[PDB]
Amino acid sequence: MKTNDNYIEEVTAKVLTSGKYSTLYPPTVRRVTERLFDRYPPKQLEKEVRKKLHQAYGAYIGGIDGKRLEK
Amino acid sequence: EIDYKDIATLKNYITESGKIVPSRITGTRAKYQRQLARAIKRARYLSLLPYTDRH
Amino acid sequence: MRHYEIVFMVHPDQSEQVPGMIERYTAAITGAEGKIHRLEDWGRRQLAYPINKLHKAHYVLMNVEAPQEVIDELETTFRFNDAVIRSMVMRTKHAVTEAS
Amino acid sequence: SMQDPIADMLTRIRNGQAANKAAVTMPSSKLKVAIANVLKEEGFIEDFKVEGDTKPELELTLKYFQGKAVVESIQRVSRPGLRIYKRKDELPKVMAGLGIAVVSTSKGVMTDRAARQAGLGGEIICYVA
Amino acid sequence: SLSTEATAKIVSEFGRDANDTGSTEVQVALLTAQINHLQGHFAEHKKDHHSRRGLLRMVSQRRKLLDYLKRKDVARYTQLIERLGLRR
RNA sequence: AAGCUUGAGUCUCGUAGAGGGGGGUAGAAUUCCAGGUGUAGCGGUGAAAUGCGUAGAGAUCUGGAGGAAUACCGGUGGCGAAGGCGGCCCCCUGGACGAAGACUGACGCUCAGGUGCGAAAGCGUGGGGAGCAAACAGGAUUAGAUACCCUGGUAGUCCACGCCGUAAACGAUGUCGACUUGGAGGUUGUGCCCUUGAGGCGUGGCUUCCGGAGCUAACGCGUUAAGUCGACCGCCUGGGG
Ligand SMILES: [Mg+2]
Ligand SMILES: [Mg+2]
Ligand SMILES: [Mg+2]
Ligand SMILES: [Mg+2]
Ligand SMILES: [Mg+2]
Ligand SMILES: [Mg+2]
Ligand SMILES: [Mg+2]
Ligand SMILES: [Mg+2]
Ligand SMILES: [Mg+2]
Ligand SMILES: [Mg+2]
Ligand SMILES: [Mg+2]
Ligand SMILES: [Mg+2]
Ligand SMILES: [Mg+2]
Ligand SMILES: [Mg+2]
Ligand SMILES: [Mg+2]
Ligand SMILES: [Mg+2]
Ligand SMILES: [Mg+2]
Ligand SMILES: [Mg+2]
Ligand SMILES: [Mg+2]
Ligand SMILES: [Mg+2]
């Protein structure tokens, strides 16, 4: 079932690994991809999850600037 | 003179450093301005003789 | 069969090898149906770039119509030699009584 | 490229009226003699002379009356890529009969006025006005 | 090495008339050795590109020469394809 | 089926070019790695700081290793279908053009599908890696600059072997052939004439500018056509979506 199940972390790690989108807990994102498994085309999974990172749920991407807060 | 076959005789004009100087040491005629000062630029395409030895 | 002109230099501190270097190189270009059109020696004059540790340099000028089957190994001979610094090969030049 | 020797003859006549020259130089051919013979009886051209030994050479002489040109506008009907044929009772009248429609009948190259009254039908070359 | 003296014996291989600087079977022999020397340069020096375009204006020339003498003399092609090894 | 030459193929005799590719060589500059000499300053931003320094920095001389690009010469010059390519320079090799004479007698123009070429960026399998430079992070900065400034650097740029075939890939102009008042600047051949005033007077290719007739709404083009004819093909049928 790699078509759908090995194709969740290829999508999920990418967000939780990048230091720009790493402002999240692993379980929080483990959830938001099983939810959005059957939501956007099977060649556009991570691609349109970036819509939920910019059009929706954004500014939390890049984060609140802690390296300006402690500053 | 007036021909263009005089390629093996430019040791009296240019120097080893790479700066072309006019014929003033010997003291000859300098009326040939286009056939010498201007005709030398046509041979800079193939540039068979090195113009700048320091480069 | 074209026209060639090999202009190289020797070692500045080895001036006695000049008459012995051209002698051992004019025999291979003679029996291959080639002759020497011009043969003049300039001398150890002054330069304008002190690049070598020792700035003396004798220039060798000679014209010979060597075939292509011999210039492939003659040019690589000066690379292994330590006295020869550099060289200069032109193209399509005829002979002249003198150049300066 | 050069795939129509008939269109080359009409180019020198059309462009020759604006340059105001005497005669032009062009190589002659079988059809070019029959075409120049029709325009010679007409006021279109004055006289032609073939004076080439190496090769036939056609020399056309234009006519200038007052300050106006004799040739008005020449079109093209029998195109090499598209040929147009008409019937004997369907001959087009150039300039309501005032023009000279050079046709190519079976007996030879003549005008459109002598084609419907004598001879047989033919192929319309162009519209010479 | 394409010298002017090496191509003197190519014209003498095909001769129809006499004292002629040109025959009907010589238009292919003068262009066969030129393309054959450039075809072998594909295997080595693969970085070449300008040399590959130049063959398009020479290899395609032979396709027009086949339909020239086909409607005239068929026996003329029996010499060209077997001696210069053209199209087997 | 049988011929000719006015479009010219090819070849002999010459010249011009960063046309393309494979080796080798030289110099300058940045930086790194070694001596001598010289020590609280150096790099850098209109103000500040981070980095780099008392384990010998910055700067200077000499020498060596590695990598990349060719200043003045260099003009909208030259070359190629386009893209693209500027160091002297060996080998291989192509295109175009000039020019007095032969031979072969339209082997000619163009095109769907297909093949090939196609900057930069990006990718796969292997190397190199001194600088610069997309993400990323140190220091400024402001009730938020991942816009700009400053200090570093992983891909990439370079090289061998492949894939993808994308641009304002513009000359916003498909190619070929023919006709058409002219002048004024460059580059590149062959001749005449007293080259004795290094020029006038002829014959070609390439390129730039101006301009009349003519063509087009207009700007302009205007003997390299976007003018006047002809052959072949492609694209586009309102603006968004
Ligand atoms: Mg390539
Ligand atoms: Mg025939
Ligand atoms: Mg080159
Ligand atoms: Mg030191
Ligand atoms: Mg001190
Ligand atoms: Mg230094
Ligand atoms: Mg290194
Ligand atoms: Mg004769
Ligand atoms: Mg004949
Ligand atoms: Mg074509
Ligand atoms: Mg690239
Ligand atoms: Mg590419
Ligand atoms: Mg790569
Ligand atoms: Mg471009
Ligand atoms: Mg376009
Ligand atoms: Mg060109
Ligand atoms: Mg204009
Ligand atoms: Mg228009
Ligand atoms: Mg619409
Ligand atoms: Mg609509």
Helices marked H in C4-67 — which ranges? 18-21
Do B17 and B53 touch, CB atoms closer than 8 A? yes
Domain total of chain B: 1
Strand F nucleotides in reach of protein CB atoms, 7 A cut-off? 1-2, 5-7, 9-13, 16-22, 24-28, 63, 70-74, 77, 81-83, 86-95, 101-109, 116-118, 135-139, 141-142, 144-146, 160-162, 176-181, 187-188, 195, 198-199, 213-214, 227-232
As given in the structure block, the two tokens for residue E54 are: 């130049």
Instruction: Identify the residue whose Cα has the smallest distance to the C1' of F144.
Output: A65
Give distance CA A35 / C1' F122 (Å): 33
| b/e map B1-28, b = 16+ CB within 10 Å | eeeeeeebeeeeebeeeeeeeeeeeeee
C71-C73-C74-C77 Cα dihedral, nearest 10 degrees: 150
Pairing verdict, β D109-110 and D122-128? unpaired
In chain D, residues 37 through 96 whose Cβ sits under 7 angstroms from any atom of nucleic acid strand F: 54-56, 73, 76, 79-82
Resolution rounded to one decimal, in angstroms: 3.0
Contact C6, C64 (CB under 8 A): yes
Length of chain D: 129
Q: Return the CATH number of the domain spanning residue range D5-69.
A: 3.30.1370.30
Amino acid whose CA is nearest the C1' of F70: B55
Question: Would you tell me the crossing angle of helices A9-17 and A26-35 to the nearest 10 degrees?
Answer: 140
Residues 6+ positions from A6 with CB-CB distance below 8 Å: none
DSSP code at position D110: E
Range of the domain at B1: 1-55
Q: How far is ligand 15, taken at its centre, from the CA of residue D60, in Å?
A: 45
Residues in C touching B12 (Cβ below 8 Å): 100
